[PDB]
Amino acid sequence: NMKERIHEYCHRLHLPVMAERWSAMAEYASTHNISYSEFLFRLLEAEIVEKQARSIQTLIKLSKLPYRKTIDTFDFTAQPSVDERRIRELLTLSFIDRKENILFLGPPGIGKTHLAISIGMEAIARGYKTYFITAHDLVNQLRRADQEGKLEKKLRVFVKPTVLIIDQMGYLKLDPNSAHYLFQVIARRYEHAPIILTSNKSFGEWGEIVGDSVLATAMLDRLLHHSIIFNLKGESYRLREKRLQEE
Amino acid sequence: NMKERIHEYCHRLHLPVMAERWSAMAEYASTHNISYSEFLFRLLEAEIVEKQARSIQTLIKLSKLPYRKTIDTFDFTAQPSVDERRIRELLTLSFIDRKENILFLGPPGIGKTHLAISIGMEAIARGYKTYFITAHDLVNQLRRADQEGKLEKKLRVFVKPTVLIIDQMGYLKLDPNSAHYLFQVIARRYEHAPIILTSNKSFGEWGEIVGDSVLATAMLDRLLHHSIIFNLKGESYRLREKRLQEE
DNA sequence: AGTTGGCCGCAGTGTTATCACTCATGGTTATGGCAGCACTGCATAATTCTCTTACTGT
Ligand SMILES: Nc1ncnc2c1ncn2[C@@H]1O[C@H](COP(=O)(O)OP(=O)(O)OP(=O)(O)O)[C@@H](O)[C@H]1O
Numbered sequence: 375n376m377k378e379r380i381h382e383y384c385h386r387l388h389l390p391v392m393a394e395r396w397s398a399m400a401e402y403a404s405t406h407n408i409s410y411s412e413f414l415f416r417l418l419e420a421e422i423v424e425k426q427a428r429s430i431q432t433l434i435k436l437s438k439l440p441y442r443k444t445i446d447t448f449d450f451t452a453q454p455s456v457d458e459r460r461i462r463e464l465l466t467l468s469f470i471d472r473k474e475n476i477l478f479l480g481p482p483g484i485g486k487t488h489l490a491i492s493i494g495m496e497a498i499a500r501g502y503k504t505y506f507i508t509a510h511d512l513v514n515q516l517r518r519a520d521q522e523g524k525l526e527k528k529l530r531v532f533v534k535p536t537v538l539i540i541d542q543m544g545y546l547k548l549d550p551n552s553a554h555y556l557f558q559v560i561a562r563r564y565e566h567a568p569i570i571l572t573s574n575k576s577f578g579e580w581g582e583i584v585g586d587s588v589l590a591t592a593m594l595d596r597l598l599h600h601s602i603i604f605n606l607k608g609e610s611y612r613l614r615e616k617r618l619q620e621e
Numbered sequence: 622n623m624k625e626r627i628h629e630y631c632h633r634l635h636l637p638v639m640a641e642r643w644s645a646m647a648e649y650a651s652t653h654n655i656s657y658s659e660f661l662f663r664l665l666e667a668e669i670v671e672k673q674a675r676s677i678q679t680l681i682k683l684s685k686l687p688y689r690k691t692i693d694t695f696d697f698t699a700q701p702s703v704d705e706r707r708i709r710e711l712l713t714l715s716f717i718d719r720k721e722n723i724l725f726l727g728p729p730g731i732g733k734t735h736l737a738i739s740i741g742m743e744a745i746a747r748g749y750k751t752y753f754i755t756a757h758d759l760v761n762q763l764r765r766a767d768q769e770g771k772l773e774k775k776l777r778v779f780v781k782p783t784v785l786i787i788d789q790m791g792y793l794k795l796d797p798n799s800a801h802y803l804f805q806v807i808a809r810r811y812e813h814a815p816i817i818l819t820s821n822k823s824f825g826e827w828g829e830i831v832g833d834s835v836l837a838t839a840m841l842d843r844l845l846h847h848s849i850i851f852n853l854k855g856e857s858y859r860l861r862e863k864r865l866q867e868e
Numbered sequence: 869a870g871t872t873g874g875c876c877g878c879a880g881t882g883t884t885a886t887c888a889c890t891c892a893t894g895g896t897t898a899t900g901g902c903a904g905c906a907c908t909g910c911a912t913a914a915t916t917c918t919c920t921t922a923c924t925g926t
């Protein structure tokens with residue numbers, strides 16, 4: 375017949391959702407006499423919707439972001455120190471065009487990691503590749519790669535992502551070898567793609583964190599050449615939620 | 622014949638209890654006209670019960686508890702400051718789903734480790750894995766593993782168990798540089814599995830014990846977010862309670 | 869009569885001087901292969917579970 379061949383060809387072209395909604399839209403046109411152009415537009419637009427939904431799901435899976443949290447889930451009133459203007463301007467992704475390294479600083483529990491993850495979710499929803507990693511894990515993987523001789527591979531894997539996120543930078547101390555391993559990534563991404571970083575220590579302490587003042591200075595210079603910092607302060611939201619649960 | 626073949630097949634299928642009791646079960650089903658399905662169900666249920674008993678035995682063996690205790694041997698009249706009902710509620714193991722952390726704080730000998738091990742035993746009974754360790758011991762083992770280079774193995778060993786019983790947090794103080802191991806364990810188990818902590822040092826002394834203020838602050842911020850803290854006020858049972866009640 | 873050794877004769881090798889040829893490098897243009905990314909499958913290694921074994925002293 376004809377329907378079977380249509381379905382088979384759609385599957386061979388990998389457009390099954392198109393075929394399904396194509397029957398629905400064919401019925402719709404039979405009911406309202408839609409032009410062939412608009413009909414095909416419905417088919418292809420819905421196929422695009424499904425394909426991009428699946429692609430964004432698999433991309434979030436590709437990225438190691440801990441959770442799929444959106445800015446909508448966040449409250450600004452509980453954190454007076456932040457301003458919606460700057461956060462939403464970052465959400466506009468102008469930094470990607472300008473290649474600005476976003477940095478978050480402040481004591482624990484403020485929510486800097488939450489905001490960074492939300493920004494990453496927006497970036498990965500808009501097609502841009504994203505990759506999440508912790509400083510300690512990044513350094514460990516780089517050292518193992520250097521040991522195995524595949525250092526270039528991991529360096530590419532950490533540099534290729536359009537938006538690289540480094541988290542928990544400062545709580546754990548780093549040795550000079552780790553300092554140079556981090557410096558390699560920083561240099562490769564000096565002016566090629568933005569870096570989103572979160573930390574609790576001031577810039578000066580990075581010398582003690584990395585075990586070398588000069589390496590810390592160089593990395594800070596390269597990171598801050600094009601950067602927008604967010605020095606946030608306030609009460610730990612974990613503690614406040616615990617208090618609310620108590621009451 | 623058939624009896625010997627049945628015994629051999631039960632042993633080859635790893636059904637020892639079934640091999641032992643199949644004759645008696647057959648006789649009982651004979652004398653009561655039990656259906657074949659119910660006969661099979663009886664055999665399988667007995668085998669399952671015995672297997673679960675042996676599994677619980679193995680889990681309690683691997684728990685590495687110093688000894689075995691339960692709430693049965695606990696007197697709440699000697700500890701009237703804290704509510705009895707809350708501990709009974711904990712015995713329902715509702716905290717395992719919520720991933721909340723259970724903290725016992727009080728003077729030495731007031732029964733902290735007793736209650737912690739009792740709750741761990743209740744968790745082991747219902748199949749949940751549990752690992753008992755002393756905080757300083759855990760940090761030392763993690764340091765040795767890191768020196769040997771295979772740190773991730775021990776980290777998984779400590780993070781995988783559903784219930785972690787970290788005791789004697791303040792008893793001993795290792796080199797402050799090793800507190801990052803404790804932070805790693807607490808953060809990796811954060812929002813994943815409960816932690817049972819028991820110690821006699823206030824929350825302010827953590828910076829001194831670990832030799833780092835911000836590190837201890839972050840550890841507590843994560844360990845106290847989802848938790849139920851019990852503060853035990855009293856005197857050393859073994860000496861003071863007997864001395865004051867024999868009068 | 870046969871085999872080996874010595875002598876003679878013939879051929880091959882070494883050094884010096886000279887000649888010839890081939891290979892390498894530089895510049896420009898074109899083509900092919902390899903590398904990178906994404907998805908799927910298999911195998912190996914590591915981890916977990918269960919049972920048995922080992923060590924020391926009474
Ligand atoms: N203003 C807020 N409104 C709602 N949730 C908040 C707010 N601030 C923080 N949180 C919540 O606090 C939790 C922890 O946030 P986050 O991990 O970003 O903290 P942090 O300060 O970066 O921590 P650390 O220094 O330990 O890495 C998240 O669940 C986030 O949702």
Ligand SMILES: Nc1ncnc2c1ncn2[C@@H]1O[C@H](COP(=O)(O)OP(=O)(O)O)[C@@H](O)[C@H]1O
Binds near residue numbers: 700734858
């Ligand atoms: N409320 C109590 N009821 C029964 N026994 C108790 C109680 N408190 C303490 N004990 C006894 O004391 C010991 C527990 O002390 P523990 O809490 O381990 O002290 P620490 O926490 O300093 O190690 C156990 O042997 C237990 O039998």
Ligand SMILES: [Mg+2]
Binds near residue numbers: 486487488
């Ligand atoms: Mg964070």
